[PDB]
Design a protein around this ligand. Sequence first.
Ligand SMILES: [Ca+2]
Lengths: 56, 222
Amino acid sequence: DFCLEPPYTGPCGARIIRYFYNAKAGLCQTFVYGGCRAKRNNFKSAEDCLRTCGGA
Amino acid sequence: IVGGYTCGANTVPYQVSLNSGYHFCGGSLINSQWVVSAAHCYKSGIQVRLGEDNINVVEGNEQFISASKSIVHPSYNSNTLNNDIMLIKLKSAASLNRVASISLPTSCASAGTQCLISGWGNTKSSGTSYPDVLKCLKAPILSDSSCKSAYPGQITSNMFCAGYLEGGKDSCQGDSGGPVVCSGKLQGIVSWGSGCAQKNKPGVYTKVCNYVSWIKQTIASN
Ligand SMILES: [Ca+2]
């Protein structure tokens, strides 16, 4: 389950704010994404995140 | 920028901030209407901020201009990060200039050349601390061999390493797209690296001297 994976910033240097599902908190949180090589637990909005991973 | 120093207000006039509701990448002004940055910094609704020092407070020397076009290099590979370069056309021309453009290089820079790297990115290697003001860093260009030994099978002819093998001085998240200026010419674009300021893991940059023709022609036909 990719929804259970920790957020992945990656090697690129950008500071782009994305969302990831935090299974321990039971909600989608923000984290800094570097701009490349995103994993699946990386969403552009909280709604997308909840729709895909909510309740995982 | 980890291990750098405060540049000083508007001492790096070609430095720009790419804003999407917040600062997310840097870039360089190479023409009154054009900005060069990294391809991985591509985003919809980009607002370019020029004449910035403290990105959090309006000090009056700014010019906020929306981008009208964003051209990512046709051969950019998001997996390998090869050709990580992008051109942004400003919706209107900037008033040059506290705001000034930087020259493109006539030729490539050699290992050992000292360059100035700048940005508003993270200042901590093992932590999170984003600055208000622009940070600077002098770092030398490293040889292709050491660069390739630091990142086996990951360095292409379009990338160069710069920094310190000891670590502690490097570019970091929030610096992407920013300038690497050597001898008054734009030689690189902050691109990627393994973590920030780690030992034996210098920062990797887009080799601008390899794109000068593409840049000049693209600016001219758009
Ligand atoms: Ca400001």
